[PDB]
Amino acid sequence: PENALDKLFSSEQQASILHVLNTASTKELEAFRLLRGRRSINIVEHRENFGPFQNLESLMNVPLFKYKSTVQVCNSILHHH
């Protein structure tokens, strides 16, 4: 986890992003431009079938997320939640 995506964020920043990923509706997620469309549905359905996100790296398990796009999504949620 020393090389985890999560290490790019402080613990409080990580908690703030995870809270949104774990509680926002698809409509609320689509307010983040990078999540408009299928990504928003994917986050909500993944958390329902696999559980709430415990770390940000876990977003790479969601279709349509890669490392770079995960970082960019998290940076947007951090600033605009």
Curated annotation (Swiss-Prot):
Origin: domain of life: Eukaryota
Location of the protein in the cell: Mitochondrion matrix; Mitochondrion matrix, Mitochondrion nucleoid
Linked pathology: Combined oxidative phosphorylation deficiency 58: An autosomal recessive mitochondrial disease manifesting in the first 5 years of life and characterized by a wide range of clinical presentations. Clinical features include neonatal lactic acidosis, epileptic encephalopathy, developmental delay and impaired intellectual development with non-specific brain abnormalities, or mitochondrial myopathy with a treatable neuromuscular transmission defect.
Subunit structure as annotated in this protein's UniProt entry: Interacts with POLRMT.
Similarity section: Belongs to the TEFM family.
Function: Transcription elongation factor which increases mitochondrial RNA polymerase processivity. Regulates transcription of the mitochondrial genome, including genes important for the oxidative phosphorylation machinery.
Name used for this protein in its record: Transcription elongation factor, mitochondrial
Gene source species: Homo sapiens
Gene, per the UniProt record: TEFM
Segment of the intact protein contained: 57 to 134 of 360
